[PDB]
Design a protein around this ligand. Sequence first.
Ligand SMILES: OC[C@H]1O[C@H](OC[C@H]2O[C@H](O[C@H]3[C@H](O)[C@@H](O)[C@@H](O[C@H]4[C@H](O)[C@@H](O)[C@@H](OC[C@H]5O[C@H](O[C@H]6[C@H](O)[C@@H](O)[C@@H](O)O[C@@H]6CO)[C@H](O)[C@@H](O)[C@@H]5O)O[C@@H]4CO)O[C@@H]3CO)[C@H](O)[C@@H](O)[C@@H]2O)[C@H](O)[C@@H](O)[C@@H]1O
Ligand code: CA
Ligand code: CA
Ligand code: CA
Length: 637
Amino acid sequence: AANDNNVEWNGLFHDQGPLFDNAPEPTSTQSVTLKLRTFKGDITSANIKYWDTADNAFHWVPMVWDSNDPTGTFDYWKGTIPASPSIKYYRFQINDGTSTAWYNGNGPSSTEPNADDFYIIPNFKTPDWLKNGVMYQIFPDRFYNGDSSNDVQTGSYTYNGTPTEKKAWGSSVYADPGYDNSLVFFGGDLAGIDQKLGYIKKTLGANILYLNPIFKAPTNHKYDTQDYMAVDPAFGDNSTLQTLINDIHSTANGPKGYLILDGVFNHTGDSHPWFDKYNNFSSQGAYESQSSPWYNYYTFYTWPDSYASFLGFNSLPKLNYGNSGSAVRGVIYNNSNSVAKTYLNPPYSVDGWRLNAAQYVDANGNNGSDVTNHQIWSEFRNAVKGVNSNAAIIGQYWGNANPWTAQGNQWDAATNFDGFTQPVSEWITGKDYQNNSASISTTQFDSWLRGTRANYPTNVQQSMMNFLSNHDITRFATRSGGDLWKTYLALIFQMTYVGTPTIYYGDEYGMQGGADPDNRRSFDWSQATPSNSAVALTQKLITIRNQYPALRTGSFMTLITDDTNKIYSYGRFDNVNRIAVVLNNDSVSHTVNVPVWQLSMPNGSTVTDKITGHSYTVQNGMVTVAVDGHYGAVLAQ
Ligand SMILES: OC[C@H]1O[C@H](OC[C@H]2O[C@H](O[C@H]3[C@H](O)[C@@H](O)[C@@H](O[C@H]4[C@H](O)[C@@H](O)[C@@H](OC[C@H]5O[C@H](O[C@H]6[C@H](O)[C@@H](O)[C@@H](O)O[C@@H]6CO)[C@H](O)[C@@H](O)[C@@H]5O)O[C@@H]4CO)O[C@@H]3CO)[C@H](O)[C@@H](O)[C@@H]2O)[C@H](O)[C@@H](O)[C@@H]1O
Ligand SMILES: [Ca+2]
Ligand SMILES: [Ca+2]
Ligand SMILES: [Ca+2]
């Protein structure tokens, strides 16, 4: 490269990883110094062009030459953006003589982009344990029956005109004739989860647990809350919860863990004392008397049998959050003994909340996705962070969650359906997460992944809940048609991508299952050992990610997108480690020349595939490795 009226795109690069941004999570007064990489001597000038919400205008900040990388192949230019609490967006204008190129969240462009700019959100920090950990989601009733005395028995109670049923372990999740799918209980409880912490934290290595609802409710999924202040008797009691949390936080049964609970705050069950539709409790619920102490907690259109609810589900009356200072905002997150604060405070001290139906939370029965909804989550974040600045907040959302994250005042991240689950599914299994046929090439996969990452600030990207499957969609192994290797590949990608790897109980061994409720089968424990090849791989991959900070908070650079041979390679790197991941999708084995020079891996240095143990030597900026179909190598140094 040289000063020849031409900017060479191949040498350009910038993202907010350690080597290019000294303040990825800036405080309200923090200056942000950035570095732009280019081929050595390729440009004549560079500017950071940023939009400031403070004064509704663009601002140009020149860059100055800073240095060359260890291989002497690139230049590093640096610039500093003035500090202030205002949100800012930036892109780069790179010039060489009369030639100009632009660069933003989606890479290089010949024309100045109008979107996908990078983010600078002052005073927005997500928990670092979330960025660096591995999550394991458990649907309580289906994991492990640690206490048989609390098991819900068949016919114990009837709800919606149907009795409950107890199911034998390993039998179909579908209710037998006469029962309802939502009232089927296998017996899984909190004692069981505690007893299997060694399997989760030691055998596998995950250190973050995310549990579906566990508070008093009549259903087996428990999203129809009856009492937020107590564990459902079938799962145990509050003391059992205190012990489980203590055991999760313990280091005696594996590494220190973290607990994230499911917060169902958009609505309650119709059997909740506040509502009490079936007249089961003393007090006069909102449904029973217009003179109820909790009448304002809900929204009726025609009292008492016509009220706002979750998507028309009668058993799910919608909570009216009213305006700031309301009684509902008090019981949920403003009061000293609010639900959110209660569990974040001792003797519980949980580590976070997953926000159920977070997009609908509103006042007066509104559908959410509006100013009020965003205002409520702003107050919620302020409260939660006040109690514990390291308490996680992850909202449920299926599309682009930018509105609840990019403002830096609401959620730390979201259920990554749009930026992880869907693309991963369509690339590997060739189905959408609902199991309808839908496929994408490797280049489209890389593009999808980058475009969605660009929807979020860097810390949010690193905090996204990335799961292959969950309780509302079909199982990955079912979408894969039982092809376990597809799970192998998915795991390798997952454990090396941006965002929190999240294992939905069972996926580690290849558990199958169709749509709800078949996606909530009882866990087959005879499969929980290295004998299951997927379990053995999972254990190894978690150890690798726990080992390299670069895989959790390092930069991400696309290296190879080959649709002919189905090869996808990308680098994850920071100031210490450089990692080139090489994946092979749906094709026979291939020998790949990995361009590690793009990662500045020096010629003559050695790299080691952390999966196989094979070592290689960098020659002429390359590493030549063989990767079989539906597998991958993790070349690191
Ligand atoms: O009253 C008649 C009827 O009553 C009973 O229930 C019938 C319904 O039961 C089941 O649905 C349950 C579900 O099993 C529960 O888990 C619970 O659902 C909650 C989710 O689990 C949470 O993640 C959260 O989801 C909110 C999201 O909801 C929507 O997403 C849906 C997708 O669109 C869809 O493709 C698929 O993936 O499902 C999801 C979730 O349902 C919404 O679009 C999205 O924006 C939002 O984020 O909250 C949920 C509610 O708390 O409750 C459900 C309702 O009770 C069956 O799955 C359902 O088919 C059935 O209608 C009796 O069981 C039944 O016999 C009787 O006829
Ligand atoms: Ca040039
Ligand atoms: Ca039990
Ligand atoms: Ca009553």
